[PDB]
Symmetry: C4
Subunit: 388 residues, 4 copies
Amino acid sequence: RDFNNLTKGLCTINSWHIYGKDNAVRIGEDSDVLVTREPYVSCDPDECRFYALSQGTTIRGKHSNGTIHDRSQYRALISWPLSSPPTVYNSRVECIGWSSTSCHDGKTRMSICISGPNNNASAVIWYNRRPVTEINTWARNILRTQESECVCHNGVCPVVFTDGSATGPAETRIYYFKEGKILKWEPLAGTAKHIEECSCYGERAEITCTCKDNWQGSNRPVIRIDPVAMTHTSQYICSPVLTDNPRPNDPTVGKCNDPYPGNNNNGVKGFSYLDGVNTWLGRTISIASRSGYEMLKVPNALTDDKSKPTQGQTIVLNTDWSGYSGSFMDYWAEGECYRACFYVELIRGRPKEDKVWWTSNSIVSMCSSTEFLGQWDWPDGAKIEYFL
Amino acid sequence: RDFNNLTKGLCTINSWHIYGKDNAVRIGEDSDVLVTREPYVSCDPDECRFYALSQGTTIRGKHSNGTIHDRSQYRALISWPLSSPPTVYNSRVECIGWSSTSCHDGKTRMSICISGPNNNASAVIWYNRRPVTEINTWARNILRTQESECVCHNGVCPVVFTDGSATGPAETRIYYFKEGKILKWEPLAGTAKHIEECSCYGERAEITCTCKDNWQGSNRPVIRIDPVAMTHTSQYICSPVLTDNPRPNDPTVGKCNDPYPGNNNNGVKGFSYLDGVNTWLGRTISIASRSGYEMLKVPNALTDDKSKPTQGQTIVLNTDWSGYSGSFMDYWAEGECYRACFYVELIRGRPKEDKVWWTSNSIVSMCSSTEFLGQWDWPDGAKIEYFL
Amino acid sequence: RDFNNLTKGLCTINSWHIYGKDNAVRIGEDSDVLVTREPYVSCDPDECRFYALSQGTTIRGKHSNGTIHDRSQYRALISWPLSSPPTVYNSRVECIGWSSTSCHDGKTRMSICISGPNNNASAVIWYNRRPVTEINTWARNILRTQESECVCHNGVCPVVFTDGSATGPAETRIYYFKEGKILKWEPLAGTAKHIEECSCYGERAEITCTCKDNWQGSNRPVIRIDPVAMTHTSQYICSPVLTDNPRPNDPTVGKCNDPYPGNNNNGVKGFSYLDGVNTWLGRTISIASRSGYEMLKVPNALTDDKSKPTQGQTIVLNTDWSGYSGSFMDYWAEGECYRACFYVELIRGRPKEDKVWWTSNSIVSMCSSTEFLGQWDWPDGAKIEYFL
Amino acid sequence: RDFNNLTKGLCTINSWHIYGKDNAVRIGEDSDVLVTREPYVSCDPDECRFYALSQGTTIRGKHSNGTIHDRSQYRALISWPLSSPPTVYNSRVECIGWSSTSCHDGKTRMSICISGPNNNASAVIWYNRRPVTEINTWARNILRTQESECVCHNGVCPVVFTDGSATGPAETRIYYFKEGKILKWEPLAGTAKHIEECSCYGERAEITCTCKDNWQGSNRPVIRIDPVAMTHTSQYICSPVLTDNPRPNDPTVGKCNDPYPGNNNNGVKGFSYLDGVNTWLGRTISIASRSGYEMLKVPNALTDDKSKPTQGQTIVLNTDWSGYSGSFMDYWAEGECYRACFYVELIRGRPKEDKVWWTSNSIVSMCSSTEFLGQWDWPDGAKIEYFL
Ligand SMILES: *[C@@H]1O[C@H](CO)[C@@H](O[C@@H]2O[C@H](CO)[C@@H](O[C@@H]3O[C@H](CO[C@H]4O[C@H](CO)[C@@H](O)[C@H](O)[C@@H]4O)[C@@H](O)[C@H](O[C@H]4O[C@H](CO)[C@@H](O)[C@H](O)[C@@H]4O[C@H]4O[C@H](CO)[C@@H](O)[C@H](O)[C@@H]4O[C@H]4O[C@H](CO)[C@@H](O)[C@H](O)[C@@H]4O)[C@@H]3O)[C@H](O)[C@H]2NC(C)=O)[C@H](O)[C@H]1NC(C)=O
Ligand SMILES: *[C@@H]1O[C@H](CO)[C@@H](O[C@@H]2O[C@H](CO)[C@@H](O[C@@H]3O[C@H](CO[C@H]4O[C@H](CO)[C@@H](O)[C@H](O)[C@@H]4O)[C@@H](O)[C@H](O[C@H]4O[C@H](CO)[C@@H](O)[C@H](O)[C@@H]4O[C@H]4O[C@H](CO)[C@@H](O)[C@H](O)[C@@H]4O[C@H]4O[C@H](CO)[C@@H](O)[C@H](O)[C@@H]4O)[C@@H]3O)[C@H](O)[C@H]2NC(C)=O)[C@H](O)[C@H]1NC(C)=O
Ligand SMILES: *[C@@H]1O[C@H](CO)[C@@H](O[C@@H]2O[C@H](CO)[C@@H](O[C@@H]3O[C@H](CO[C@H]4O[C@H](CO)[C@@H](O)[C@H](O)[C@@H]4O)[C@@H](O)[C@H](O[C@H]4O[C@H](CO)[C@@H](O)[C@H](O)[C@@H]4O[C@H]4O[C@H](CO)[C@@H](O)[C@H](O)[C@@H]4O[C@H]4O[C@H](CO)[C@@H](O)[C@H](O)[C@@H]4O)[C@@H]3O)[C@H](O)[C@H]2NC(C)=O)[C@H](O)[C@H]1NC(C)=O
Ligand SMILES: *[C@@H]1O[C@H](CO)[C@@H](O[C@@H]2O[C@H](CO)[C@@H](O[C@@H]3O[C@H](CO[C@H]4O[C@H](CO)[C@@H](O)[C@H](O)[C@@H]4O)[C@@H](O)[C@H](O[C@H]4O[C@H](CO)[C@@H](O)[C@H](O)[C@@H]4O[C@H]4O[C@H](CO)[C@@H](O)[C@H](O)[C@@H]4O[C@H]4O[C@H](CO)[C@@H](O)[C@H](O)[C@@H]4O)[C@@H]3O)[C@H](O)[C@H]2NC(C)=O)[C@H](O)[C@H]1NC(C)=O
Ligand SMILES: *[C@@H]1O[C@H](CO)[C@@H](O[C@@H]2O[C@H](CO)[C@@H](O)[C@H](O)[C@H]2NC(C)=O)[C@H](O)[C@H]1NC(C)=O
Ligand SMILES: *[C@@H]1O[C@H](CO)[C@@H](O[C@@H]2O[C@H](CO)[C@@H](O)[C@H](O)[C@H]2NC(C)=O)[C@H](O)[C@H]1NC(C)=O
Ligand SMILES: CC(=O)N[C@H]1[C@H]([C@H](O)[C@H](O)CO)OC(C(=O)O)=C[C@@H]1N
Ligand SMILES: CC(=O)N[C@H]1[C@H]([C@H](O)[C@H](O)CO)OC(C(=O)O)=C[C@@H]1N
Ligand SMILES: CC(=O)N[C@H]1[C@H]([C@H](O)[C@H](O)CO)OC(C(=O)O)=C[C@@H]1N
Ligand SMILES: CC(=O)N[C@H]1[C@H]([C@H](O)[C@H](O)CO)OC(C(=O)O)=C[C@@H]1N
Ligand SMILES: *[C@@H]1O[C@H](CO)[C@@H](O)[C@H](O)[C@H]1NC(C)=O
Ligand SMILES: [Ca+2]
Ligand SMILES: [Ca+2]
Ligand SMILES: [Ca+2]
Ligand SMILES: [Ca+2]
Ligand SMILES: [Ca+2]
């Protein structure tokens, strides 16, 4: 109809309720489920769907051998009905590639897929299910993007890309697209020293992105975008409640403008909702591996370098595998506020479970409740032994 | 369009004709059919669909081992086209959880799923395929609901929940929802001493629910709701034709306001159509197990404590497995009256058939005819030996 | 929109072109294809679909054992996209039963399914996907119907039923339905001595049905219905070109008002287009079994007792299995005339191919061309050996 | 809505970006994917889909044995969602046959399938999913057509057919259809000596077709059609950059009006975009087999007999199998020009990979970019060993 505008603020997050779970690995032990990784969720005005990067093979298929690898010519961004598994028969290919983002602007959807060899990748921006724009690698070193939904305001949908080293300074760019065309792009500015895989959400005409500093930071870089002025800033979550993985133990004081040190060249896509006292941080429980997942209410985390948790909710037990996590919201729901939501990627197989030769995942996702709901843990649920 | 109003009375029930049957277990012996239990049927203005609680695995899948269990993080309310089986590829997830209800109000559908550990469950009410409201457990003991469709009148859709013991007094509540929001809730009142899994239908602006007294009653508790005044009453079916299972042999006089004794802490979801002389009771044939199923016309069963059958129809032979049963009607059909319908859950596997390690079911459903039709029996039809 | 009216005459049939073929048995050797029999084709204003009676199991499934049987509680009328196979995932159940008919009246579709034990069957007439009317067996001996599409004119859709013996006089009735309700029914009249499985088509406000005399006739009975006056007549195709199976060798003179003798208590559903010189008869090539299939132009077959072929077209080689055949037309196509079409059921398995324990079929269908097209033969195509 | 008119010229082709890839053979190793060959892509105003000629069996199915053969009664033109594989459950049959073409005219789609024995084939032209016209073989020797999309202008959709020898002069005809009816047909004229499998596209009210001279030419014949005057011309691509396969090594001067000699009675469907300096030729890398694939910018190839490459892009490595290739464009995209696209058929199995008994393929397709994008190679990706 008309382009959606971020006119609402976030609903008060007093807890998280179960939103969607596909049990993909369990079901896929005996049905035609595609092998995936890098999933996310994204809504259209009339439906919300699960998204991910297929490996172009089923889990039980012999081609599942080797799917620990990240970039091949057999991957594609696919979407499928909420809480169903990604099957060969119900998955819709949005575009071909090994890194992606997607978002609906209120009128139609924009999907971006990057493909190519490491030194010659290119992104192709689809709008209304047609290719409209292409961008060639500018640093010749794995052009890559969000791996979760972008956000739009009045037709403008900003997207964060990075090209260059994963263990040194790289060239991050913020592109402002409208109808799949480039209106403008900026180089990254601010104090964030390295940016990868931004998780974004919007409220009151502002887009907040919690990304990852693969190079040096265990605290997360944050990019705030003004989609009207098409400008942005960057910093790190000041809080001592560190949210990357692997990471060192929590200090009593964090860092606002520098990566918090202790772990180099590694990390996991993550997210946060930064809204004053209504601030919630997600993170793996383990400081060493992609194990467990919890939400922690850390009032003023973004700006308070001594902020610590005041409430929390366990999502995945530390004795269960987690993975990537990101933000999304149904901007077309009823009500006066936007209900914060997120998904957690539950990785199964390699490298942690090497008795099988594949790597895949299932999805669990939650949204906020103004109620103080009881908690449950939500594991993948599959028995690897069955796949042997 | 406009909210549906229960303006019609029931059609005269002179017999039952076959409405739907999915043969899920038979077909699933060699195709991707999800393992389920707790099924029901529910109509939208333009389509009627089968519903159930998936176990997040196929019947042939190795994860089918253990599906006798009731509540896990891998269950979800799913719906699928009438008389098709619940397959991985055609099932639509309505919400995540292990106890549910759902109903269309004429404009859109409301679906409710409860999930959680036994002492910390919560219900989340979806409306128009979006989460709108959440309710936390109030008794910290398996918050649970209908397991069949709710009914709406002018936007108001009452739902019966129970939280607390299954073998002693519990806290039953009647919530009146409108557009997924809570308008009001009452504690249970009347003479029903224990309420679980209500089967409801509506006619002439009144909603009748035939539930189950798990604690002490072999006769069924009945809740009648006025969706305008948003008030209700409760009693038991007075008839000596006892309809729970297990149950003692039929007496010559029943009980109107107390559970009829003889069997404690057990029962099965069931239903009835209470409409004066046009009253029909469904029940298992066996007084000991979920075996067989028959419909008995028992004029004035609700209020006459000596009422006995005047006509009947066998649905499932006593040499075949049955299970849960419930009511639903197509409130959007043509004609001057609402045609009473019901489904019977045909449980296969554990605990009765333990040579297999799973528990699932298929669905058979009937609706009334003003004709006096010949009867057939409708068994699940699968041979367990094939699954060995 | 508006009820369709049979305002056109038939197009000139100079040959037959390929319309649809699903290769169900071939494909089903390694995919989830339902076991069926008694198929047909039927059009809606916007789509034409394949129809059949499922056996409630896949061909490869273990429950396929025993599917030679005709009536069980696991059968249902299903429809699926033209030329696709009937799979568990794409088949839509129209109704439950073991004998059926279906037709669109221009506004919506009416589907009829009969179910029950031999002495207590009943038909339930669905209209707009809802049950509207029920008819109880009147002769208590396998109430049965067309097994191919019915035809409508201005809302009136006549259907031919038979109840009673298959080897002696029975009670055949012609019901005239409108919106699923019974407007009127007549007993069979005319000279046809036994009627079963009528294949009908309509043109210029007249409905012609070529049925089968299971009891005594090797020539086919024909019922002509006036859907406005709601009256009909009956006779036999006068032609010496005999079209039932099994049958005796063709004589030089046929019979107009009595079954042509030689074979008792057996036959196969078949059809014809009776339109003066534009008359075409379908039949198996074999006079002994359901083997082969050919179309023969026999000018004035209905009324000329010495009519012999003037042109012909082989559809299935005598070294290939055939089965039932029936008529249908796309009454909603463009143009000035109705294009005659038909389907042939290609039966595989029992009883002819007993190395397998199942019985199923695939569908081949043709429509007429005003051109004189070259012919090909169209066999099922599956290798039974593969199923062993 | 209204018939589409070719009002735009081609966009400048500076490189090719990835458009679609289904990874059919990989995925089909463990899912219900139909065996195919002769694929193409074609757009409707609201969606673009993959097309191909099914073999009426899955790859893993036992009936896959023998699918190297070209024409059987079990083939059909099917279409399925872009970048999905052709599965038994998502494939839509357009028509029955072993040679086809299809195109949308802006209002609805026309699909043509030819079937029959070698000496008695016939084409049936479907429009709006209904059969409208039939054409009988005129040379009684494998009537055959494009094997890729046709193109329409103001309702007129020309199609090129050939009937007669594949190794000597044959009878090629250009039919001009409108709403599935024949407006006119011409015999081939011009200097092309043999025509088979034309790949066409349209721009500025002109339709260009790059076909194949199976008999003598290693350079490609080109037919240019005026869909208004319903007239055409024919010649060969003058360029020394030879594009058929097998073929002799490139000379320094090509031929404009005669087949370039060196290889007889063989070839592969291919294509080109002939637009002055904006001219790009596709071809296998190998001069001996259907191996590899590259795009070469050869300014003025059509008219310059000494034109050589000025830029290029590798699509498939010479160490990977290719096959047929053809043109298509989304005539309903936004913008001021038509974006050239093409697909390459990636053949797997027989005859090159004879350890398996089947022959199938997957699809890779690209469209042009005005950017100078980095290149990647796009192989089928399946390991034949897995199928053993
Ligand atoms: C039914 O459901 C309800 C609803 O969920 C249940 O009630 C919930 O119970 C939750 C568990 O108790 C509870 O969550 C915790 O909240 C704490 C905050 O509340 C407390 O402090 C505030 C502030 O003073 C008080 O106001 C309040 O009254 C409470 O006293 C959090 O602090 C908890 O998180 C910390 O502990 C967990 C382990 O429990 C860690 O995993 C987590 O990471 C936090 O601790 C680490 O991080 C801090 C900060 O740096 C460190 O200081 C600390 O030492 C830990 O650091 C180590 O561990 C991390 C992670 O591994 C590592 O990185 C680091 O290096 C160190 O090694 C927790 O979030 C809910 O808030 C509560 N909800 C409600 C509404 O009440 C109820 O129990 C259920 N009922 C039943 C019967 O089960
Ligand atoms: C073709 O189709 C038609 C249509 O269906 C067939 O005709 C139908 O035939 C049915 C079977 O006969 C018949 O159903 C029965 O109806 C009885 C009522 O009708 C009779 O009584 C009335 C009232 O006086 C008369 O007017 C009427 O003329 C009849 O005489 C019911 O009473 C029957 O149910 C009871 O029996 C069945 C076993 O048959 C039990 O399963 C059932 O539970 C009922 O009996 C138990 O319950 C009562 C009440 O408490 C007890 O008193 C009794 O002892 C039984 O109790 C034991 O069993 C229960 C259950 O296990 C247990 O809990 C308890 O503790 C005890 O152990 C039955 O419903 C249809 O009405 C009739 N329909 C029509 C339209 O005619 C026709 O036959 C078919 N044709 C062919 C050729 O097959
Ligand atoms: C390319 O394609 C074209 C288009 O299809 C091909 O041309 C077609 O070729 C067809 C085969 O020849 C041909 O079909 C036949 O037509 C005959 C009628 O035409 C002839 O007679 C008329 C009338 O005088 C002439 O005008 C005309 O010029 C012809 O001379 C039919 O009579 C044929 O059917 C009979 O024969 C077949 C076997 O071929 C039987 O299966 C069939 O049942 C018919 O014969 C039985 O029935 C009759 C009637 O009772 C009996 O008299 C006769 O003895 C047979 O009876 C036995 O068999 C039956 C069945 O088993 C059994 O029940 C009974 O008891 C007995 O045992 C046949 O239909 C097309 O018309 C023709 N089409 C066109 C447009 O030309 C062309 O050849 C192809 N090209 C190539 C290169 O292959
Ligand atoms: C990142 O991505 C970019 C973008 O893709 C990469 O840059 C691209 O690199 C491509 C490979 O170099 C390049 O493609 C070539 O372009 C040549 C034309 O450019 C050159 O000449 C022009 C004209 O003078 C100059 O202006 C320009 O500056 C260049 O110097 C083509 O000529 C190339 O094709 C020929 O070579 C390939 C093998 O590389 C053959 O396969 C191909 O068929 C061509 O050669 C055959 O055909 C010609 C013509 O008849 C014969 O003369 C020649 O001998 C060959 O003939 C044999 O082989 C054929 C085929 O087997 C056989 O039939 C015959 O009988 C003979 O046996 C090639 O197309 C892109 O244009 C370039 N793109 C851009 C935008 O720059 C970049 O490298 C990537 N980065 C990294 C780090 O990898
Ligand atoms: C989001 O904001 C823009 C205004 O910035 C709204 O756009 C106006 O919409 C009306 C109706 O379409 C037009 O007549 C105005 O010209 C539009 N645009 C501008 C840029 O001025 C848009 O409608 C808002 N979205 C929604 C859902 O209300
Ligand atoms: C393509 O061209 C034809 C004109 O040749 C356009 O046809 C006219 O369309 C209008 C609106 O439908 C009619 O009133 C004219 O009579 C049409 N036809 C002719 C043949 O004159 C057609 O609209 C054009 N297509 C598009 C998409 O604009
Ligand atoms: C484009 C790409 O390959 N991105 C991969 C990502 C990066 O390799 C990592 O961010 C370092 O750059 O790692 C991970 C990862 O799980 O750590 C997943 C992504 N597939
Ligand atoms: C929420 C829940 O677990 N409900 C279960 C139900 C209850 O356990 C029973 O009603 C007693 O409370 O039992 C049964 C049952 O078949 O007896 C099924 C339900 N899954
Ligand atoms: C209702 C029913 O069972 N009809 C069956 C039909 C009849 O048995 C036959 O017409 C004789 O009555 O036979 C055949 C048959 O193939 O001969 C198929 C039908 N399934
Ligand atoms: C109608 C038909 O069979 N066409 C086939 C085609 C021709 O055989 C070839 O063009 C020579 O005529 O060959 C090839 C081929 O791959 O060479 C594929 C086509 N299936
Ligand atoms: C998987 O691939 C590895 C590496 O190629 C190979 O050694 C291994 O045996 C394969 N495992 C299986 C089950 O194919
Ligand atoms: Ca399978
Ligand atoms: Ca890091
Ligand atoms: Ca009880
Ligand atoms: Ca007979
Ligand atoms: Ca050639």
